[PDB]
Amino acid sequence: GPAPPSIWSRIVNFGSGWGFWVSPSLFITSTHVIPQSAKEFFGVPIKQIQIHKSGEFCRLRFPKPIRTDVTGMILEEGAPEGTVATLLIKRPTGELMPLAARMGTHATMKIQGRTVGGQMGMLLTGSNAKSMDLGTTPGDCGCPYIYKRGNDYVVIGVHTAAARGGNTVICATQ
Amino acid sequence: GPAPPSIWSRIVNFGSGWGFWVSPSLFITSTHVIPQSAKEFFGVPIKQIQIHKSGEFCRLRFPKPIRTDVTGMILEEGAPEGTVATLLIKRPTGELMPLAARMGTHATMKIQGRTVGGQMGMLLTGSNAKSMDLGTTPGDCGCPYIYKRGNDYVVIGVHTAAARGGNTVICATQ
Amino acid sequence: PSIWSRIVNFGSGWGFWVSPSLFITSTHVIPQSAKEFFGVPIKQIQIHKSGEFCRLRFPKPIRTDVTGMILEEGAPEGTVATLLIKRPTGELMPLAARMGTHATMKIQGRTVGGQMGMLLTMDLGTTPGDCGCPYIYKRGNDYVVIGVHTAAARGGNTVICATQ
Amino acid sequence: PSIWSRIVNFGSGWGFWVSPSLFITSTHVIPQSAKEFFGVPIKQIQIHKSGEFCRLRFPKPIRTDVTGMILEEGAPEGTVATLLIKRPTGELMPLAARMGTHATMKIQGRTVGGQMGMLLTGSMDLGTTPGDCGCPYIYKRGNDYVVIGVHTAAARGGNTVICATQGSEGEATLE
């Protein structure tokens, strides 16, 4: 098992994609996945939420605990070079997909014509970054990148882009 | 103000579509949007959940309340013929779309190659049923049909099918 | 893009981007204490008012993401159009409205002219804040805009869509 | 039509529907108390055991939903195939494995044969488990996935793996 169920339960639908409950009050997602026409997130009006955007990484701090079931989790500003992280994808079908990804340097690139920055990852699934069965889909944005630092699990960011050419994905960081 | 924010909050993403919290433990949705591969619905394993499927209408009663923020609501089998209900669509962008729908007879259709049943509904939008901006999309299935009987709101079913070429829609009931 | 993105908050109500340079709205929704619309001095905006139908032709294209829509002066009598109401709650509300003859009526102590419509639609009624929202129907494959919401008779059944 | 749906539990492990009527799995995963497989008596099933590879051709199509797929005896050396692991947790884990020479591996006093490979994850827990035996190895040729065998064993370190194929290929005897 690459990810305990206590970590899969933290991944929940948000807007056009997903997001991750780092802590009962902290929630990370991709900026372009945010539902920009919504007036509330998880029952809290927007004005009450501390929204901090670092590129396409988005951090939401809620005034009161939203997910009491989760515990506080370590958040690293990207993984160390060469770390084999796991992109924990949830699909609308209910499928869980731990996609192994070798994390590389931080870079910026044009993906859809937009310029996306973040830590580069090279999917270790045998397919290109864009594959319904073996890779990512546009709807997977917001899903977390996790690795194991000693005995602890560490979120290094969230899925923000998948290059069409090969196995390159972008993990939005900090 | 067609529906108060307390009613829109009950509408939440579920699988390939949406669902509606009638009470803290009651959750209705469309059968064909259920995440079939998911072992857990809202953190609760599907084995502890009471699932009752009537046609393409699905009811789920959970062991312990999850949405303790919403009060119990009246759920009845369809609406009196001629009633002007509102299909309360949520979109991944966060937009809210209350589409007026004059409810008609209970009947069955051939939709997408499958046989579907429920209370028919003529959209009073002035546009087609499968319009992208002014009508329903396949991803709206599970959203509620709600009308107001006197001073009480009454949910009558969930959107399960939209006919091509006209304002006809299907509200799965029971 | 979505047609709703063409409906933007404007003054005390709304307005509709027909083309990247043409913006239709209701006059009684226009702000008074403002000499700039969407970032252009008024005197450099071509502003034409026909009763309560105001149109603003801008010097350069403000909304380059939108196509050019067909703006006709009302719909043929009996046509079922859609009033696209956007609400501050985030609610997008298409209301069916059968359009009829031209009408001049005293509503809210004010003589309003336009094309009359009859809404075919708990509270799915018009509010004062809706004024400026567009009336639109589909002719063949072409979405036609026929005017903007300018008035609503008491009872929420009869409405006036400013035109011309 | 997802390829993961072709992977289903079988005995103590998994197996893969190559076609509506063809099923492949690992030999040691098969239940020894076998009176029927997928509702078909064994006498009616055409069974081919090549070492740790087991092919079951059923008299009539069982999985009418799946389309015919190409089964090859291994992949070309250097091919980055994909081991499609299914877990009872619901996790679908595609693991990249660089495929190499055909080989036998010493394990449990015996020998297991197949095309060997090395997982691209190297040496957190993204490795195989014995319960994964029977899961398919695949690789994309052209625009079609090709199954090359099923997982049967991993070396002690868990990086070297054995993809059991239809069988070992020998040297031709000419004339």
Side-chain angles (χ1 to χ4, degrees):
Chain A
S6 66
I7 287 115
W8 287 106
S9 77
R10 300 165 176 259
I11 304 162
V12 302
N13 214 95
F14 184 71
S16 50
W18 304 81
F20 186 81
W21 283 104
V22 185
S23 73
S25 305
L26 194 63
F27 183 86
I28 59 177
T29 186
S30 172
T31 56
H32 72 78
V33 152
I34 295 156
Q36 282 186 18
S37 297
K39 312 302 173 184
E40 58 86 65
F41 294 158
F42 299 97
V44 181
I46 289 306
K47 314 182 291 281
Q48 271 197 290
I49 302 168
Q50 303 166 71
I51 308 180
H52 179 99
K53 294 167 172 225
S54 173
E56 290 194 12
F57 178 95
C58 184
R59 193 193 290 241
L60 307 178
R61 208 171 312 119
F62 288 82
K64 58 207 165 24
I66 310 267
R67 286 287 301 280
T68 60
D69 63 307
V70 317
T71 68
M73 173 170 292
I74 301 172
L75 191 300
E76 190 171 355
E77 292 107 59
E81 197 131 308
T83 305
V84 173
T86 309
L87 164 53
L88 311 178
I89 282 167
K90 277 190 169 175
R91 290 284 164 79
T93 60
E95 296 167 319
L96 315 180
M97 278 173 66
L99 304 191
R102 193 153 272 131
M103 306 307 314
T105 61
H106 287 74
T108 317
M109 53 178 311
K110 282 102 164 212
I111 285 280
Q112 173 263 10
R114 105 184 168 274
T115 321
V116 197
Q119 186 171 19
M120 303 315 250
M122 197 192 42
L123 286 189
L124 308 176
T125 69
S127 84
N128 294 337
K130 297 205 53 153
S131 171
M132 185 63 156
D133 294 333
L134 310 185
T136 75
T137 68
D140 298 339
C141 290
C143 281
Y145 284 79
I146 300 204
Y147 84 100
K148 190 103 136 153
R149 189 196 198 279
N151 265 67
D152 306 298
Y153 283 104
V154 175
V155 270
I156 66 179
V158 292
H159 188 68
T160 197
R164 208 194 43 240
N167 47 18
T168 296
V169 294
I170 303 182
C171 170
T173 279
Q174 73 102 11
Chain B
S6 71
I7 280 171
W8 289 107
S9 70
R10 298 160 174 261
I11 307 167
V12 307
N13 176 295
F14 189 64
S16 72
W18 308 81
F20 179 74
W21 286 97
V22 188
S23 81
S25 319
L26 242 194
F27 188 72
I28 57 180
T29 185
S30 177
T31 56
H32 77 263
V33 313
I34 296 171
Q36 295 281 72
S37 309
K39 319 297 218 221
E40 72 143 60
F41 296 159
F42 293 91
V44 193
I46 70 86
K47 302 94 208 183
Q48 311 181 28
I49 296 173
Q50 315 309 329
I51 294 109
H52 289 71
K53 292 193 279 198
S54 176
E56 292 191 1
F57 171 98
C58 178
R59 189 205 270 92
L60 291 94
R61 207 153 324 94
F62 291 56
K64 56 166 175 288
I66 302 100
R67 292 293 303 263
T68 59
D69 57 326
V70 296
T71 71
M73 193 174 270
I74 301 176
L75 172 91
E76 86 181 7
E77 196 272 275
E81 196 150 353
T83 304
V84 176
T86 321
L87 172 57
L88 301 178
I89 290 177
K90 267 192 175 176
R91 289 288 159 81
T93 61
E95 282 161 337
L96 314 173
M97 283 192 74
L99 291 324
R102 167 162 287 113
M103 310 315 301
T105 67
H106 286 71
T108 71
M109 290 197 69
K110 270 53 177 182
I111 295 275
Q112 310 286 22
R114 54 172 173 81
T115 318
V116 48
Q119 200 186 9
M120 290 314 254
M122 162 173 131
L123 289 174
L124 309 170
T125 58
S127 198
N128 286 72
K130 289 283 271 272
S131 176
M132 72 315 273
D133 312 311
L134 311 198
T136 76
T137 73
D140 305 327
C141 296
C143 289
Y145 282 85
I146 292 170
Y147 79 108
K148 177 135 135 53
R149 143 146 50 70
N151 271 36
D152 294 333
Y153 277 118
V154 187
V155 47
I156 58 172
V158 301
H159 178 73
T160 205
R164 78 181 151 42
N167 50 34
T168 280
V169 284
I170 290 168
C171 168
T173 63
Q174 283 116 47
Chain C
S2 191
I3 185 177
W4 294 97
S5 64
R6 316 168 83 105
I7 305 160
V8 308
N9 220 84
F10 188 74
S12 70
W14 300 87
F16 186 70
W17 283 107
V18 182
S19 80
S21 321
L22 176 46
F23 189 75
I24 63 174
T25 193
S26 171
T27 59
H28 77 81
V29 143
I30 280 296
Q32 176 180 310
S33 182
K35 320 202 180 149
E36 83 89 6
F37 286 150
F38 293 103
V40 186
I42 288 180
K43 292 182 178 181
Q44 282 307 90
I45 305 176
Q46 317 180 6
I47 310 205
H48 210 285
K49 292 197 255 76
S50 34
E52 296 227 332
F53 180 93
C54 178
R55 57 161 137 141
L56 305 175
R57 194 136 40 241
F58 287 55
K60 71 151 208 93
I62 301 293
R63 285 289 297 256
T64 72
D65 60 314
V66 313
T67 88
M69 274 198 35
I70 300 165
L71 171 65
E72 274 155 13
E73 297 190 353
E77 182 187 325
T79 293
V80 175
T82 305
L83 170 53
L84 255 69
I85 281 153
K86 197 182 298 192
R87 291 282 167 76
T89 58
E91 279 161 314
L92 310 181
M93 208 186 198
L95 286 194
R98 189 177 300 281
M99 311 312 291
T101 75
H102 191 269
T104 61
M105 200 177 21
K106 177 159 63 54
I107 307 193
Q108 295 156 29
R110 158 249 299 190
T111 295
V112 65
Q115 184 174 17
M116 161 168 330
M118 197 177 274
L119 299 182
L120 319 181
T121 72
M122 185 54 145
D123 176 36
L124 309 174
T126 282
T127 75
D130 299 333
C131 291
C133 278
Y135 279 80
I136 279 146
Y137 76 105
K138 185 167 283 289
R139 194 179 37 168
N141 40 303
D142 306 314
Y143 259 135
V144 178
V145 56
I146 59 172
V148 298
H149 187 89
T150 199
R154 72 169 90 110
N157 182 67
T158 288
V159 290
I160 304 294
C161 160
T163 64
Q164 179 181 340
Chain D
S2 170
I3 189 177
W4 296 97
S5 68
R6 312 168 81 104
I7 310 170
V8 299
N9 277 118
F10 189 77
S12 65
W14 302 82
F16 184 71
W17 286 101
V18 175
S19 70
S21 63
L22 197 65
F23 188 78
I24 61 177
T25 192
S26 182
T27 304
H28 71 250
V29 143
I30 289 132
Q32 300 180 231
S33 97
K35 299 330 170 319
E36 50 76 27
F37 294 144
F38 300 99
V40 180
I42 275 63
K43 174 59 182 62
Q44 301 182 24
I45 325 190
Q46 186 168 348
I47 304 188
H48 169 239
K49 314 275 193 63
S50 186
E52 328 305 315
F53 180 93
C54 178
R55 206 208 282 111
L56 311 176
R57 183 165 293 279
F58 293 85
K60 315 247 158 293
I62 309 284
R63 288 292 301 270
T64 65
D65 59 305
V66 317
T67 62
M69 215 174 126
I70 296 171
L71 173 65
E72 292 286 271
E73 192 286 287
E77 295 189 23
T79 301
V80 178
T82 299
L83 176 50
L84 304 177
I85 287 161
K86 261 194 173 181
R87 293 281 165 82
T89 63
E91 292 160 311
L92 308 174
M93 217 173 41
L95 295 181
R98 189 172 293 276
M99 308 307 292
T101 62
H102 281 61
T104 46
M105 188 176 69
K106 295 146 100 80
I107 179 154
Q108 305 211 82
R110 302 295 172 183
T111 281
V112 299
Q115 185 174 13
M116 62 102 89
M118 299 186 172
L119 301 180
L120 274 61
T121 54
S123 308
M124 191 46 236
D125 181 4
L126 286 161
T128 70
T129 65
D132 295 339
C133 287
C135 284
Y137 288 66
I138 60 90
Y139 79 99
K140 182 63 126 37
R141 193 173 70 199
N143 77 310
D144 300 323
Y145 292 137
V146 160
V147 54
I148 62 177
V150 294
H151 181 86
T152 274
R156 283 167 300 157
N159 180 258
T160 284
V161 289
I162 306 302
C163 166
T165 73
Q166 293 174 99
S168 278
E169 174 166 318
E171 270 181 1
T173 305
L174 305 183
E175 300 261 274

